[PDB]
Amino acid sequence: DSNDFVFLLSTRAGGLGINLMTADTVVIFDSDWNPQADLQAMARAHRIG
C-alpha cells in the first residue's frame, strides 16, 4: 500500500542487503569508476524472483 514513487540512493551505501523488490526502473544518474558498484546498484532491484 505504498504511495512512494521514487527512491533515491547514494550508490555505495547500504551494503548488499537492501531489498528493493517492488521497484522496476533504475536510473544511474552518476556513473561510478568501479562498474561493480553500478552492478550492485542494478542488482538492488534485479533480485531473484
Added chain:
DNA sequence: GGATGTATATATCTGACACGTGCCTGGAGACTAGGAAGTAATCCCCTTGGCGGTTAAAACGCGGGGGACAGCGCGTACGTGCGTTTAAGCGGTTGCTAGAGCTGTCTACGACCAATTGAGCGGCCTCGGCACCGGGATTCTCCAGGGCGGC
C-alpha cells in the same frame, strides 16, 4: 613754544647659492663560467567526495554554593608646601695615555686545486632475550568394600 609717536632710509648680520678642487667610487665596455631555467622519468603524498562502525567527547539541563562585586569604615601612608642644605652644572688646570687615522713592510695563514681514502648511510647475518611446545614431578577428587541397625 618744547618734546613725543611714527614713517622712510642705511648699515650690518646671517642663511643660502654657486664656484672650485680632489678623489675615489660608481659606471661603461669586454669576457667568461656556472647558476638556474627547462625537460623527462619515477614515486609518494595530498585533494574531494563519499561509506561504515566505535566510542568517547561535546552538548544540554539543573541545582547550589562559592566567589565577584558593591558598600562602608578606618587609619595610615603618601601628597603638598615650605625652609634649608647640597651637590649638579659650568668653566678651568695639567700632564699623560688611549685611540682614530694614515702610511709602510712583511709574513704566516687561509683559499684553491688535484688525488686519495675512510667515515657515513643502507642492507644482511648473527646473538640476547622473550616466547611456544613437549615431558617429568606433585597434589586433589572420587568409587567401592566392610560393619552396624531395623522389620
